[PDB]
Structure formats: structure tokens, C-alpha cells
């Protein structure tokens, strides 16, 4: 079958990991400062 | 903490209108690391007193629910 030459290849390649910048937990995200803050007089 | 919590309970039994005594009772429950008991007590107080304008109680509920995580919508409210 001498016709137009064309290749079909579906692209489902997984991308590289993004490695985004990491958030910093607040002081109120730790249990001991929470205990200090809630027990305030 | 035990003595203060008992005194808060006696104050609550004497006069139920003392909101400060109940909030101090919840604070003493937090002091004795009784997170679940304090959460149940706070939910009971909120459901009995939905019209009360206890801002610090709602702030403490939001912090507790954020620590729990699953109740994030109640924390937002």
C-alpha cells in the first residue's frame, strides 16, 4: 500500500517530579506551643 | 489541675450561668491532656448554647478541629 507516510504514537509519558518549595509549619502547628498557648491564663 | 477542675465543676453545679467557669473547666481538661473529653464537653456546651457569643470557645474549637483535621469545615465556621 504505497500511500502517505505518517506515524501514530500516543504520548502518555510521565513528567519528571516537580520538587516544589516546602512550606514551613507555624509555631502553632507543633503540639508543645499549642499546649503553652491554650493553657494561657 | 485536678483541684482546679473540681472547683470549676462545683462552680458549674452551683450556677450554670457562669460561662467562665465552664471555659476554665475545658482549659483544665486541656491541661490534663484530656483532648477527647474537652472536645466532647465543648461540643455539648456549644450545642446547648448555640446563641452564646463565646468567641474564645469558638477559637478553641477551631484550633482543636484543625488538630483533628477531619472537622475542618466546623473549624472554618
DSSP collapsed to 3 states, chain A: CCCCCCCCCCCCCCCCCCCCCCCCCCHHHCHHHHHHHHCCC
Lookup result for grid cell 482546679: B4
Does B26 touch chain A if contact means CB atoms closer than 8 Å?
no
User: Which residues, including other chains, have CB under 8 Å from residue B41's CB and lie 6 or more apart?
Assistant: B22, B25, B26, B29
| Three-class DSSP category at B17 | coil
Q: Are B25 and B8 in contact (CB under 8 A)?
A: yes
What is the C-alpha radius of gyration for chain A, rounded to an integer number of angstroms? 28
Rounded Cα gap, residues A32 and A28, in angstroms: 9
Measured in whole angstroms, how far is the alpha carbon of residue A1 from the centre of its chain?
49
Q: Are B57 and B42 in contact (CB under 8 A)?
A: yes
Angle of CA points B74, B62, B29, to nearest 5°: 120
Tallying the residues shown for chain B, one arrives at 77
Say which experimental method was used: cryo-EM
Rounded Cα gap, residues B63 and B52, in angstroms: 19
Given in angstroms, what resolution was this structure solved at?
3.6
Measured in whole angstroms, how far is the alpha carbon of residue B66 from the centre of its chain?
15
Q: Are B60 and B29 in contact (CB under 8 A)?
A: no
Instruction: Kindly identify which residue of chain B lies nearest to residue A34, measuring between CA atoms.
Output: B63
Helices within chain B (DSSP H only): 2-14, 19-31, 35-48, 55-68, 72-76
Q: Which three cell numbers stand for residue A1?
A: 500500500
Rounded Cα gap, residues A4 and B56, in angstroms: 75
- Which candidate in A38, A39, A40, A41 is best for mutational testing of the B interface (most B CBs within 10 A)? A38
Which residues of A fall within a CB distance of 8 Å from B60?
38
Amino acid at each position: 500500500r504505497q500511500d502517505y507516510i505518517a506515524k501514530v504514537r500516543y504520548q502518555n509519558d510521565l513528567p519528571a517530579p516537580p520538587c516544589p518549595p516546602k512550606l514551613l509549619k507555624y509555631e502553632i502547628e507543633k503540639e508543645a506551643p499549642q499546649k503553652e498557648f491554650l493553657k494561657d491564663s | 489541675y485536678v483541684q482546679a477542675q473540681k472547683q470549676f465543676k462545683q462552680a458549674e453545679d452551683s450556677q450554670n450561668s457562669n460561662t467562665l467557669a465552664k471555659l476554665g473547666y475545658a482549659q483544665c481538661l486541656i491541661a490534663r491532656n484530656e483532648v477527647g473529653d474537652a472536645t466532647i464537653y465543648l461540643e455539648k456546651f456549644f450545642k446547648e448554647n448555640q446563641d452564646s457569643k463565646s468567641s474564645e470557645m469558638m477559637l478553641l474549637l477551631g484550633i482543636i478541629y484543625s488538630q483533628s483535621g477531619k472537622s475542618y469545615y466546623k473549624a472554618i465556621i
